[PDB]
Every structure is written in structure tokens, then in C-alpha cells.
Amino acid sequence: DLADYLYKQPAEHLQLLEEAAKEVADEVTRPRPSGEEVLQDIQVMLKSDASPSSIRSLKSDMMSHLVKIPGIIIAASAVRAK
Amino acid sequence: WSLHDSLCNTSYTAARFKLWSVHGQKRLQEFLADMGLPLKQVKQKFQAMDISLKENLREMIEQSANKFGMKDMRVQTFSIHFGFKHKFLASDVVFATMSLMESPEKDGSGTDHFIQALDSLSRSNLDKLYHGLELAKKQLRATQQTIASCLCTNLVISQGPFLYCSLMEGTPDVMLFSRPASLSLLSKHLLKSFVCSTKNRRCKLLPLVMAAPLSMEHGTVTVVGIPPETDSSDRKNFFGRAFEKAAESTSSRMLHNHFDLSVIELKAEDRSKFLDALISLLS
Amino acid sequence: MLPRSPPLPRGNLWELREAQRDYLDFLDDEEDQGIYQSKVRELISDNQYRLIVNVNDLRRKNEKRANRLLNNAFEELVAFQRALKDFVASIDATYAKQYEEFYVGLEGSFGSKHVSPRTLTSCFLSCVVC
Amino acid sequence: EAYFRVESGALGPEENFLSLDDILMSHEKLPVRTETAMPRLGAFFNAVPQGSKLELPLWLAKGLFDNKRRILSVELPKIYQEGWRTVFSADPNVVDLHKMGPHFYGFGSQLLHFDSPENADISQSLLQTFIGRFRRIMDSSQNAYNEDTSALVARLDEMERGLFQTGQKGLNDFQCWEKGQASQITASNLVQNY
Amino acid sequence: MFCEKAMELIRELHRAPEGQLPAFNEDGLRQVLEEMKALYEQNQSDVNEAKSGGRSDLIPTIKFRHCSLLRNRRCTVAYLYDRLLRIRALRWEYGSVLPNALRFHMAAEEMEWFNNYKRSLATYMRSLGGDEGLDITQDMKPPKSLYIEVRCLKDYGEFEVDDGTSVLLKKNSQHFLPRWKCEQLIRQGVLEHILS
Amino acid sequence: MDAAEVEFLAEKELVTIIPNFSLDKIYLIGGDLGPFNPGLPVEVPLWLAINLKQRQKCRLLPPEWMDVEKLEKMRDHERKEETFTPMPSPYYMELTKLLLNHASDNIPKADEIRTLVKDMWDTRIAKLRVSADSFVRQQEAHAKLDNLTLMEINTSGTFLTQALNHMYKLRTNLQP
Amino acid sequence: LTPAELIERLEQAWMNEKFAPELLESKPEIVECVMEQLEHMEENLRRAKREDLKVSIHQMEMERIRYVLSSYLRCRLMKIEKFFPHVLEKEKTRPEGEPSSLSPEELAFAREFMANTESYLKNVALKHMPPNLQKVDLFRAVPKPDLDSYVFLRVRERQENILVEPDTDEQRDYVIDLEKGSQHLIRYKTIAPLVASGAVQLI
């Protein structure tokens, strides 16, 4: 069931995933030695082995659904704060 | 595989649907549309298909295959689970093993592939099985591109009491079937597609005989023989005697090297000298 | 080649009360070798606002403050520049009123802070960099 | 597994005789100032003046040294001077001890046989650099598995690479026991030829 | 300064830290013995000349040459000793007999050192116990089970079973033998332990 | 050492099996065993229980400390305390590997025992690299390790001792 | 000395040699009295071989003991071949009444090893040298053992008043005590005479 929610409502479920990754990385590395005792935040990436779509196949019914597209990087902004 | 690439390649729905002629390829489209399977989910791998479709797939497929004349669609097999993601049907292990042992590209003596296929039956080697499933795919997609040749070109000669065919080197993916063991399956699927394709009433009940070149240097071909096909064929072949007596009559050069008798290696020049005497012998 | 110091290190021969009361003690500097009481006066004789400090000295004097100053630069530099006006009034209060507020530069060798505009990420927010 | 090279004594009182690490270590050059003339051998640098700045290997300046500085006196390279001795105190996890080397702790412990004044301040740099760079070799060597470690090891010296290769050999040996893999009997040194 | 020739013997062994025996260097070794002799005489001349005219100011030119031979001694015993380590390994890893891809890289006097070491070792081994002692060369890993399943990888004439019941070893043909016999051959490269 | 010999020393622990073959007392150079009555328990050293299980001749039994309840209390006791707390057996990792790999169907709730054991291990290893960092950080000369089993010692010992020798050297290079 | 205890003491004699940084004591008694159980129970199997399961249970245990023992021996023929001159010297000048660190057979092996290597270096590079260097002494080319190593040990005979010297400053030495069954991480020099007296064991 989870890997289906994650395909349909990825926004409000990646949050729960990344908040469980932080509660597991706490009971595994503790006691942190001396210089760190505040628990950091774990950016959960995710990959898959599924057939890729294409940019020309992004119809508006795919709004807020995990997609998987190939391409070629053409530009790159400068990093900023957020 | 995906649910689409496995309908186009099973040599039981690739025959009924006649998935080699544009006129009947729309039959597959209609079959898919009658179930409510989007044409975009059917093209994607089966493990990634949505969870709301696959509920009763194995029933909505058996049903909508009555409406097309395919009533033997469910078979009785077994399946195994090891752990979290390991789920095999007893006819996936078979197609993977059968294609680790008969890989086309040869890397040594005759007993170098045998070892690698004997290896992939113990659970400590799931990295060979999971690899021998990419050969078994590559083979099945390079069989329906040959049975599509000898049926959009009519290379099945009705040489009398039995059909007959042959192959050409120039056609791509014909060196894959050079082995004298991976040739019987190609012929046995060719017969199944043919019998469903032809309009006659005689050809639909004649055994097939096939030859494809073995060795260019010795200039020899390999020949097989398969029983007359039908739904309830007893499976009692009879060519091990025919070929023997024919080579005896013509007094040519033959080799009954294998354990089964119905597979022979024959000089490229004794082909007709052998075949005519065989035609007369079977009569 | 990595510039891990403004002075090229190869050939140089050829609450908020603790911070303010530790900086003052550091700026006394009389009893060891008088390095900064030789500089406060020096700038008063030149009419300067700011004086340049060596954090390399802050380390040897007090490590805790030297680390708390490279990671909370704002709350520490508002306490440095206060306990500097305090220490200039302790020499010449007449001068200590000519100028509104003093300033304090920095120089020395920061550990990982020596960054380029390409490496200046957002983990250096509110942190002295070079 | 059975080829036990002779280890390095370059950290104790005196280097070992047969250790191929110390032999290449002491070969590194060092600056000296001569106290007399150098007759019959001024060809290299016939006689050489007194009070001349020359560059000699370390092994040479071992016997050519005395307490009275009869033949020559020595002055330390800048890597051990007062300049860099503050850099290595700012944050020692940043320095490229392979360019400043590649024998830092090995060389620095042999510059204590020259009874210079600041020895009580070199033997405190080394100790406080090695202690500084420890929690980054204890943790980037026991926690780097099946990775390309040729970038976690690009800024280390021979006394530290020997430890980064002992963390890995104990990580890759427990991870090979956990996976039922350290039961099969294998060829030991023949797979080195292959 | 000096010693730029000896330091081409060492800076070569320092490139092979795996334990692989490289080809002997008679050339450089002769080339450094020659420099030893040269400096020896050219220094002894002025040594006895500093007792025949009082040139004591040459005393430095003695040390600069006295020590500069000790170096060339170190860098030629270490090399000659290091190579005697990478050889003894070939008795604990390969076995009693070596293939001639190895016995072609050792200088012709190291074979005598070998055949002495090997013989003294085989002497010590047979001395431990009453009946022909205990062959401590085998048994490198804890025993796990009592039988092992091997699979040949090269041809090999006719392997022996103690009871005179030989076994042919064709390629890619797996047996089920007691691991008490297969250890010698697995550790060389002939057989292979499959059913781990 | 190396894990494959700690595993050798761990195959001397006693376990209890239920044979299904007849055999009379055996006098081993390391004690006595038997007799083996079909369908009756008997206590043997591990290296024999495993070897008999592989040959389909017995049926293992879970050791008493291998319970899914007492373990769920050890796992909490370990995270509360701030020192190395005592453990069921000096070789629990190797037991709960060999057993659960070879007799996972004769042990109920194997895949919870396994996760609790791993949870304990992943903590007792975190306390070590804190007890092995204060050592260096403060340049001690002694350290009392309380209840370390041989396996935790051996997973990070040949690095710790080798990096403390290089520290003793650097700390005593100025006396002469 | 029940045959059951020879093995319990053999494993203990096996770990110490693996961890110690120096060639420890010689136990000729045990190495010669385990080669008896092996020599005997190798006969009550080849004779009464007509059982097919008992002989397996015996052969497995024999193969475990013959590995403990063998790997113990090999671990000392590495100490001897790395420290041959310092181990010959120590045995030549031994005060009578002290347990040797070499068997009568390892002694012959070490003698032949030193002889062989000297007669090898004599004919390759030490012969063609100027006639005052042709003698090199092998007490200053082979590095001595390093007894300043750190070791984990677990003690089994309560010791008190043990000296812990962190550094060269004689003042900074605080004395410690040892419980029973505890485990510590201390330098090998300060507990050298305890390993020879069974009071500890290097785990």
C-alpha cells in the first residue's frame, strides 16, 4: 500500500518518510560521540527501475504524481538559499 | 516482462491473435480495451503497474478470452517464495535455465555453459537466474521475428506427405538457432503458428520437417522432425526411423550424434539426394 | 596551492556578559608581552576607527571564545566592539567620544572558513569566512 | 598474508636498518650551513667556503653533525617553522599532508636528533596534529564500503595510509563474514599474478 | 649527492607492495659495487696522505666519504634481504615446487638459499611427533565440514587417492573429495571450492 | 584475529538437539556425549549440532536466552545504561547467526529475534567509538572495558591498538 | 591433566601467541602430549573403521584439534624467522632455572636459518666490498621486538598494585587494581610477567 500512496500523493508522504528516516538514524548512531549531539535531517532520495516517460507525455492528469523522465541538462543556475 | 510484451510473444496468443499481420493486430487492441487496461499501463513493467488494476487480472483475462476463441488460458502450476522480493513461477525457472545452457555466443568447450546452468539452480546463485532471465527474454523476442518471416513469405513448402522449410543466413538472428537443441523449439512453435494460420485442410494435419545450416566449413545442415500437430496429439514421433532408412537408401553421409534420433547433421550437397528418397520412403 | 592564511605561511621570515568580560581581559594584554596595548595607542595616535586582530592569539589565550566567535559572529562582534570602546575609554575618554562607534577587523588563520565564492554554501550562514 | 615486510621505526629513537620506508624517508633533503671549508669535494655544490647554505639528504647530516657544530649547523624547513605551526593549530583536518611530505611524522621525529632550541615545540605540534586528525580517519575508514576511496585517501601520509588500510581490512572482513562469504577456500597469492 | 644508483634498486621494490618477486638486478648491483670501490680507493689515498704531509684539513673529506659508503651498503643489503622475504612466501603459499615463471626471476644463488630453507623446514616438521610429525604447511583456515566439493579448472595428469585409487582431472568436472587432500591444489589454482 | 576464528571459538557453546538416530556414548577428547535416543533431547557442542542438522539428522532448539520477550528488555536496558551492560552469552552474535541461518524453521519468531540482536549490536558498537575517542582525545593510558565480547573487540581492535602505538611513540620522543 | 583439559589449556596457549608482541614461553609438555591423543585415536579409528557415523564424529574433532595445534606452531615460526639473532642471543645467555623460549627443535631450525642467511649474504654483496666492511653485525640490522604495544587482556587472578605509567614523568603514575574477569587495554610491558604466570590472557 505504501508504495502506491507514494506514487499518488508524493508530497504529503515524502514528509512522513523523511521524518521516519530521522527517527531511525537516531536509534542507530546514538550515543553520538562529543562534538555532535543534535540530530541532523536526512534527505531521503529515491530511485527506481521502471520505464521512463517523456516530456511530450506529461498530460495535466499527471499533476502531483511521481514521474520519471530522461533528458539532457542544458543550463544550471547558481545555488541560492531557501 | 510487461503485460504487453508477453502477449505478443507467448506462442499461444501470438498464434490465435495472428500477431504478425497488421489486419489482426487490432485484435490485441480490442482484447485490451475490453478489460479497461489503459494502453499506458499495459506497456509498463508488471511490477510497477498500478495496484488497482491487478486485483482480478487472472480472471478478467480468462473471461475476455472466451469471447475470442481461447478457452485454454489457465494452467495448473506451482510457485515459490523465498523472502521479501523473490517470487517465481515454475515456468520461469525453466525458461531461464533452458537459455543459460543454450546461449548463442560460445566461450569454450561444450561443457562450459552446462556448468553455468547447473550453478543457477541453488538459491545461493540468484544472480545467475536473474541473469538467465534476460537471455530467455532476448530469445523469445527473436523467435516471433522468425515465425513472422516464414509466414509473411510462405517458406513452408508442401513437399507431399510432410511440410518443409529452410532458413537463410542473411536474415538477422539466424545464427542463434544454430545449435542442434535450440532448433526443436523453434520448429515446434512454427508448427503451432502455421496450423492456426493456413486455410487448407490437408496442411493442418501434416508433420513438419525443418533444416537449417550447421557448419559452413564442412558445409552441413541440421534436420529435425516433429509429429503431426493437434490439440490431443499423442506425441509419438516417427522420424528416427525415416531418416535412418533414407540415409541408408541414398547411402549419403549422416550423423545421428545426439541421444534422440530425430536430429541429424547432413552434407549440404546430399540434401536433395536424401529428401527425394525420404519422400518416396514415407510415401 | 591553498591559501590557509592572509600572511603567506611559507616565507614570513625573509549571557552576553561573559563575552564582553573576556574580550576586555584579552585586550588588557599588558602582563604577557603588551602586544595590543601597543596597538590601541598606536591607532589613537593616527585617529583610526578599527583595529585588526589576530584570531591566532585568541586561540592561545582562550580556545572556547575563539570557537564561539567563528560560529556566532554577530552576537560576538556586537560584544567585541563594545568591550573595545570600553577599553579605549580606559586610556583617553576625550578621544573615546570623538567617534560614534568603533569597529574591529579580523585576520589570522580560520580553519575551514577559507572558502572561495564557489564553495560558499549555506552552512556558513552567520559565520566569519575569508 | 605471509609477506611481512620490515616495519618502520622512524617514530622512535632511530630508524631501522632494513626498512625500505625509512630508507626512502631519510633521502629527503634538508638545509644546512657549513662551519669549515670542504676541501677536495667542492665539485658537487676544489673547496667550499664556511658559512654556506647547502641542501643535503638527512642521512648525510647524521654523521656530519656534532654537539659543537664542528662541520655544519642545521635549520629546519619551513613546514616545521613557526609559520606553519599555527596553521596546523587552526584546524588540522584541512592540510594536505601528502604535498607537505609524503613523510610528515617520520621526518619530524628525526629532526629531534639535532638538539635545536624549539624541540619542546615540535614534539607538541606532531602530537597535537595527529590527535586532531584522528576522528576523521577512525570514521572515514570504518565506514566507507564498496566506495571509490581514492579521494578519501588523497591527503594523507605514510603513517596515516597504513591505518586507513587497516580500517578497511577489518571492515571488508566483517562484511565478508556476515554474508557467509568467508567460508570458501581461495587462492591466496596466485590471484595476484592473475 | 651520492647514492643515486642504489636508490634505483629500492625505488623499484617500493612500487610492488603486494609481495610479487620482480626480476633480479645484477646490472645496478654491479654498478653500485663499482662506486663503492671507487670512493673507497679515492678516499684511502687522502687518508694515508693525511699522515704523509699533515693535511688534517681534509678530515671532513673523510667523513663525507666514510659515511657515503655505509649508505651504499645499507641500500644493497636491504634490497638483498627484502628479496629474501618475497621468496620464503613461495613456500607457504604455492608449495614445495614452483613453476618456472618464478624460478626464472630468482638470481641463481637464491635457489640455493631456497633449497636450504625448504630442506631445514621439512626437517623440523618431521621432528614434532613420533610418526613423521605433523605437516604444518596445510590447514590454513578453520575446518568447517568433513567433505568438500571441488571443480577442476585446468588439466592435471592423475591425482592420487591414498589407497591407490587414482582420479583423472579433466576440465569442468566436479568431484566430492575429502578436504584433507584438496587443500594443496585449491590454494594453487587448479581446483576450486564451489559449494561454499 | 579474524572473524572466521572467532566463529571457530564460538562453536564450543552447548546447545540442545533432538536426534532421530540411535547411537551409544561417544568419548571425545573434549568430554563425553550421548547416548542418542531417537526423540529425546541431548546437549552437544554447536559444531556438531550444525553438522548433524545439515545432514538431516536432528532438530535444533532455541536457547533460553533467545526469547522474544527477554530480548525486548535487553534492547531497552542497553539503550538506558551508559556503559557496556552484560549480555546473555559471550558469543551471542555468532549464535544468532549460525542458528538462525541453519535452523530458522525450528525457531519461532526468527525474524524478530534477529532484529533485536541487531539492535543490541548496533548500540554496543556506538558506545565503543565513544569510549575509543575519549581515550585519544584526553590521552589516557588505561581503559576498563566492562562487558565487551570478543567480537566487538575484534571488529575494531587491530586499528585501535595500532593507532595508539603511533601515539605512545609521538608522546615519548623528547625524553632523551 | 585429564585429556579434556589439555585442549582447554591449548586454546589459551594459542591466543596469547597470536596477540603477544614477543616470542613467549615454550610449552614442550603440551605440544608433545597432544600429539599423543592424535597418535592414539588415529589408531582406534583405522582398526574399528566398520562403523560409518562414529568415525565421522571422531574425525571432525581430530581435525579441529589438529588445526588449533598447527596454527599455534606456525604462529611461532614467524616470530623466530623475524627475530632470529635476538632469539639466539637470549637463549645462549640464559640464567639456569628459567624456562627457555625455544624448543630443542626450533633451536636447530633457528641455528640453520641464521647460518643459511649469513652464508647467502656472504657470497653476493658482502664479498665484493672493500676489505673492512665485509662484516655486518646482525644485532643492529634486525629490529628488536616492540614491547610498548597496547593489548586487550582479561584477567583471571585478582591483581592489585599495578603500575600505570602514561608518560616519562615519574610523578604522573597512578597505581591501579584489577578485579576478576574484567578486561582492560594496557601496554604490554607493564603486564609482561603476568602472561607468563597465567594471571591474565590476551584476548
PDB file of C-alpha atoms in Angstrom, chain G residues 38-195:
ATOM      1  CA  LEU G  38      46.179 -37.631  17.940  1.00  0.00           C
ATOM      2  CA  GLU G  39      48.588 -40.539  17.572  1.00  0.00           C
ATOM      3  CA  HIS G  40      46.340 -42.894  19.566  1.00  0.00           C
ATOM      4  CA  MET G  41      42.825 -42.047  18.392  1.00  0.00           C
ATOM      5  CA  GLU G  42      44.175 -42.271  14.865  1.00  0.00           C
ATOM      6  CA  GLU G  43      44.520 -45.997  15.572  1.00  0.00           C
ATOM      7  CA  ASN G  44      41.193 -46.810  17.218  1.00  0.00           C
ATOM      8  CA  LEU G  45      39.592 -45.491  14.020  1.00  0.00           C
ATOM      9  CA  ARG G  46      41.662 -47.241  11.356  1.00  0.00           C
ATOM     10  CA  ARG G  47      41.082 -50.519  13.223  1.00  0.00           C
ATOM     11  CA  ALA G  48      37.390 -50.356  14.179  1.00  0.00           C
ATOM     12  CA  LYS G  49      36.522 -48.498  10.981  1.00  0.00           C
ATOM     13  CA  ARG G  50      33.468 -50.672  10.294  1.00  0.00           C
ATOM     14  CA  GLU G  51      31.120 -48.067  11.736  1.00  0.00           C
ATOM     15  CA  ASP G  52      30.235 -45.197   9.428  1.00  0.00           C
ATOM     16  CA  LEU G  53      28.891 -42.483  11.768  1.00  0.00           C
ATOM     17  CA  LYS G  54      31.062 -42.762  14.879  1.00  0.00           C
ATOM     18  CA  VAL G  55      34.222 -42.394  12.822  1.00  0.00           C
ATOM     19  CA  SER G  56      32.825 -39.162  11.414  1.00  0.00           C
ATOM     20  CA  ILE G  57      32.181 -37.668  14.856  1.00  0.00           C
ATOM     21  CA  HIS G  58      35.746 -38.559  15.751  1.00  0.00           C
ATOM     22  CA  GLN G  59      37.422 -37.353  12.566  1.00  0.00           C
ATOM     23  CA  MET G  60      35.789 -33.948  12.832  1.00  0.00           C
ATOM     24  CA  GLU G  61      37.105 -33.342  16.336  1.00  0.00           C
ATOM     25  CA  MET G  62      40.556 -34.593  15.395  1.00  0.00           C
ATOM     26  CA  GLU G  63      40.536 -32.141  12.505  1.00  0.00           C
ATOM     27  CA  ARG G  64      39.606 -29.288  14.836  1.00  0.00           C
ATOM     28  CA  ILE G  65      42.378 -30.057  17.311  1.00  0.00           C
ATOM     29  CA  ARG G  66      44.953 -30.577  14.564  1.00  0.00           C
ATOM     30  CA  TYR G  67      44.164 -27.077  13.364  1.00  0.00           C
ATOM     31  CA  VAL G  68      44.389 -25.377  16.747  1.00  0.00           C
ATOM     32  CA  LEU G  69      47.749 -27.069  17.297  1.00  0.00           C
ATOM     33  CA  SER G  70      49.090 -26.499  13.792  1.00  0.00           C
ATOM     34  CA  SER G  71      48.156 -22.841  13.596  1.00  0.00           C
ATOM     35  CA  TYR G  72      49.745 -22.437  17.007  1.00  0.00           C
ATOM     36  CA  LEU G  73      53.054 -23.821  15.769  1.00  0.00           C
ATOM     37  CA  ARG G  74      53.004 -21.726  12.592  1.00  0.00           C
ATOM     38  CA  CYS G  75      52.478 -18.621  14.690  1.00  0.00           C
ATOM     39  CA  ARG G  76      55.860 -19.181  16.350  1.00  0.00           C
ATOM     40  CA  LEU G  77      57.848 -19.983  13.252  1.00  0.00           C
ATOM     41  CA  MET G  78      57.018 -16.450  12.299  1.00  0.00           C
ATOM     42  CA  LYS G  79      58.412 -14.961  15.498  1.00  0.00           C
ATOM     43  CA  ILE G  80      61.610 -16.964  15.049  1.00  0.00           C
ATOM     44  CA  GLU G  81      62.258 -16.057  11.433  1.00  0.00           C
ATOM     45  CA  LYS G  82      61.675 -12.374  12.082  1.00  0.00           C
ATOM     46  CA  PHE G  83      63.772 -12.198  15.273  1.00  0.00           C
ATOM     47  CA  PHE G  84      66.381 -14.864  14.715  1.00  0.00           C
ATOM     48  CA  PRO G  85      69.508 -13.147  16.118  1.00  0.00           C
ATOM     49  CA  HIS G  86      67.796 -11.697  19.173  1.00  0.00           C
ATOM     50  CA  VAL G  87      66.219 -15.077  19.886  1.00  0.00           C
ATOM     51  CA  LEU G  88      69.524 -16.922  19.540  1.00  0.00           C
ATOM     52  CA  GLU G  89      71.336 -14.493  21.836  1.00  0.00           C
ATOM     53  CA  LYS G  90      68.643 -14.670  24.516  1.00  0.00           C
ATOM     54  CA  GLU G  91      68.904 -18.449  24.535  1.00  0.00           C
ATOM     55  CA  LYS G  92      72.695 -18.531  24.696  1.00  0.00           C
ATOM     56  CA  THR G  93      72.931 -16.375  27.850  1.00  0.00           C
ATOM     57  CA  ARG G  94      70.021 -17.779  29.806  1.00  0.00           C
ATOM     58  CA  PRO G  95      70.375 -17.947  33.610  1.00  0.00           C
ATOM     59  CA  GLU G  96      69.813 -21.548  34.659  1.00  0.00           C
ATOM     60  CA  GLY G  97      66.407 -22.071  36.186  1.00  0.00           C
ATOM     61  CA  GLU G  98      64.450 -20.039  33.636  1.00  0.00           C
ATOM     62  CA  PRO G  99      62.031 -21.577  31.113  1.00  0.00           C
ATOM     63  CA  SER G 100      63.502 -21.387  27.636  1.00  0.00           C
ATOM     64  CA  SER G 101      61.732 -19.587  24.821  1.00  0.00           C
ATOM     65  CA  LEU G 102      62.831 -22.161  22.235  1.00  0.00           C
ATOM     66  CA  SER G 103      62.198 -25.872  21.887  1.00  0.00           C
ATOM     67  CA  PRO G 104      65.236 -28.092  21.274  1.00  0.00           C
ATOM     68  CA  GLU G 105      63.992 -28.385  17.674  1.00  0.00           C
ATOM     69  CA  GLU G 106      63.108 -24.777  16.959  1.00  0.00           C
ATOM     70  CA  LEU G 107      66.619 -24.136  18.241  1.00  0.00           C
ATOM     71  CA  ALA G 108      68.141 -26.266  15.494  1.00  0.00           C
ATOM     72  CA  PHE G 109      65.877 -24.624  12.930  1.00  0.00           C
ATOM     73  CA  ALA G 110      66.942 -21.159  14.082  1.00  0.00           C
ATOM     74  CA  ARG G 111      70.619 -22.109  14.033  1.00  0.00           C
ATOM     75  CA  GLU G 112      70.307 -23.368  10.474  1.00  0.00           C
ATOM     76  CA  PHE G 113      68.326 -20.295   9.441  1.00  0.00           C
ATOM     77  CA  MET G 114      70.940 -17.864  10.725  1.00  0.00           C
ATOM     78  CA  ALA G 115      73.709 -19.962   9.181  1.00  0.00           C
ATOM     79  CA  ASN G 116      71.946 -20.121   5.815  1.00  0.00           C
ATOM     80  CA  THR G 117      71.214 -16.416   5.573  1.00  0.00           C
ATOM     81  CA  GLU G 118      74.728 -15.437   6.642  1.00  0.00           C
ATOM     82  CA  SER G 119      76.255 -17.794   4.088  1.00  0.00           C
ATOM     83  CA  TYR G 120      73.947 -16.241   1.497  1.00  0.00           C
ATOM     84  CA  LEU G 121      74.785 -12.617   2.196  1.00  0.00           C
ATOM     85  CA  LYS G 122      78.462 -13.594   2.282  1.00  0.00           C
ATOM     86  CA  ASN G 123      78.565 -14.511  -1.422  1.00  0.00           C
ATOM     87  CA  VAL G 124      76.528 -11.835  -3.212  1.00  0.00           C
ATOM     88  CA  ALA G 125      77.345  -8.379  -1.853  1.00  0.00           C
ATOM     89  CA  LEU G 126      79.471  -8.692   1.299  1.00  0.00           C
ATOM     90  CA  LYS G 127      82.288 -10.408  -0.620  1.00  0.00           C
ATOM     91  CA  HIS G 128      82.944  -7.815  -3.335  1.00  0.00           C
ATOM     92  CA  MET G 129      83.217  -4.958  -0.839  1.00  0.00           C
ATOM     93  CA  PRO G 130      86.289  -3.087   0.379  1.00  0.00           C
ATOM     94  CA  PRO G 131      88.054  -5.283   2.924  1.00  0.00           C
ATOM     95  CA  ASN G 132      86.785  -3.596   6.062  1.00  0.00           C
ATOM     96  CA  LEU G 133      83.002  -3.610   5.502  1.00  0.00           C
ATOM     97  CA  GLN G 134      82.692  -7.320   4.692  1.00  0.00           C
ATOM     98  CA  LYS G 135      81.406  -7.901   8.231  1.00  0.00           C
ATOM     99  CA  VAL G 136      77.949  -6.641   9.211  1.00  0.00           C
ATOM    100  CA  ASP G 137      76.592  -7.458  12.659  1.00  0.00           C
ATOM    101  CA  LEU G 138      73.023  -8.743  12.799  1.00  0.00           C
ATOM    102  CA  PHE G 139      72.180  -7.278  16.190  1.00  0.00           C
ATOM    103  CA  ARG G 140      71.742  -3.821  14.651  1.00  0.00           C
ATOM    104  CA  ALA G 141      70.079  -4.720  11.357  1.00  0.00           C
ATOM    105  CA  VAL G 142      67.199  -6.919  12.583  1.00  0.00           C
ATOM    106  CA  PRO G 143      64.901  -4.717  14.707  1.00  0.00           C
ATOM    107  CA  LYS G 144      64.207  -5.953  18.213  1.00  0.00           C
ATOM    108  CA  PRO G 145      60.657  -6.788  19.321  1.00  0.00           C
ATOM    109  CA  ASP G 146      58.491  -3.854  20.371  1.00  0.00           C
ATOM    110  CA  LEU G 147      57.169  -4.333  23.903  1.00  0.00           C
ATOM    111  CA  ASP G 148      55.432  -0.934  24.026  1.00  0.00           C
ATOM    112  CA  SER G 149      52.346  -2.264  22.260  1.00  0.00           C
ATOM    113  CA  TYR G 150      48.820  -1.914  23.572  1.00  0.00           C
ATOM    114  CA  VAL G 151      46.804  -5.060  24.224  1.00  0.00           C
ATOM    115  CA  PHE G 152      43.350  -6.014  25.413  1.00  0.00           C
ATOM    116  CA  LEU G 153      43.503  -8.555  28.203  1.00  0.00           C
ATOM    117  CA  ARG G 154      41.064 -10.241  30.544  1.00  0.00           C
ATOM    118  CA  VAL G 155      42.357 -11.204  33.961  1.00  0.00           C
ATOM    119  CA  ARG G 156      41.536 -14.290  35.969  1.00  0.00           C
ATOM    120  CA  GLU G 157      43.558 -13.920  39.186  1.00  0.00           C
ATOM    121  CA  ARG G 158      42.779 -10.742  41.134  1.00  0.00           C
ATOM    122  CA  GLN G 159      45.762  -8.402  40.954  1.00  0.00           C
ATOM    123  CA  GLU G 160      46.336  -5.217  42.927  1.00  0.00           C
ATOM    124  CA  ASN G 161      49.051  -2.555  42.920  1.00  0.00           C
ATOM    125  CA  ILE G 162      49.747  -2.468  39.179  1.00  0.00           C
ATOM    126  CA  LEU G 163      51.825   0.423  37.862  1.00  0.00           C
ATOM    127  CA  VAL G 164      50.398   2.528  35.023  1.00  0.00           C
ATOM    128  CA  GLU G 165      52.986   4.873  33.536  1.00  0.00           C
ATOM    129  CA  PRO G 166      51.342   7.167  30.965  1.00  0.00           C
ATOM    130  CA  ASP G 167      54.471   9.108  30.052  1.00  0.00           C
ATOM    131  CA  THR G 168      58.066   9.842  31.077  1.00  0.00           C
ATOM    132  CA  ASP G 169      57.034  11.906  34.118  1.00  0.00           C
ATOM    133  CA  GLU G 170      57.547   9.521  37.036  1.00  0.00           C
ATOM    134  CA  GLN G 171      55.103  11.594  39.106  1.00  0.00           C
ATOM    135  CA  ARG G 172      52.081  11.110  36.845  1.00  0.00           C
ATOM    136  CA  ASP G 173      51.948   7.368  37.553  1.00  0.00           C
ATOM    137  CA  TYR G 174      48.748   6.300  39.267  1.00  0.00           C
ATOM    138  CA  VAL G 175      48.551   2.737  40.502  1.00  0.00           C
ATOM    139  CA  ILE G 176      45.518   0.633  39.568  1.00  0.00           C
ATOM    140  CA  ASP G 177      43.952  -2.653  40.643  1.00  0.00           C
ATOM    141  CA  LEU G 178      42.297  -5.475  38.731  1.00  0.00           C
ATOM    142  CA  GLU G 179      39.132  -7.415  39.518  1.00  0.00           C
ATOM    143  CA  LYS G 180      38.489 -10.975  38.306  1.00  0.00           C
ATOM    144  CA  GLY G 181      37.035 -11.466  34.848  1.00  0.00           C
ATOM    145  CA  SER G 182      37.482  -7.798  33.952  1.00  0.00           C
ATOM    146  CA  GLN G 183      39.045  -6.609  30.697  1.00  0.00           C
ATOM    147  CA  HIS G 184      41.486  -3.761  30.167  1.00  0.00           C
ATOM    148  CA  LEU G 185      43.527  -2.052  27.448  1.00  0.00           C
ATOM    149  CA  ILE G 186      47.086  -1.595  28.694  1.00  0.00           C
ATOM    150  CA  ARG G 187      50.618  -1.599  27.335  1.00  0.00           C
ATOM    151  CA  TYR G 188      52.283  -4.975  27.106  1.00  0.00           C
ATOM    152  CA  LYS G 189      55.350  -4.004  29.114  1.00  0.00           C
ATOM    153  CA  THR G 190      53.590  -3.370  32.402  1.00  0.00           C
ATOM    154  CA  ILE G 191      51.935  -6.808  32.403  1.00  0.00           C
ATOM    155  CA  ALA G 192      54.697  -8.920  30.852  1.00  0.00           C
ATOM    156  CA  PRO G 193      55.311 -11.199  33.884  1.00  0.00           C
ATOM    157  CA  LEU G 194      51.576 -11.819  34.285  1.00  0.00           C
ATOM    158  CA  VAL G 195      51.143 -13.599  30.947  1.00  0.00           C
TER     159      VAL G 195
END
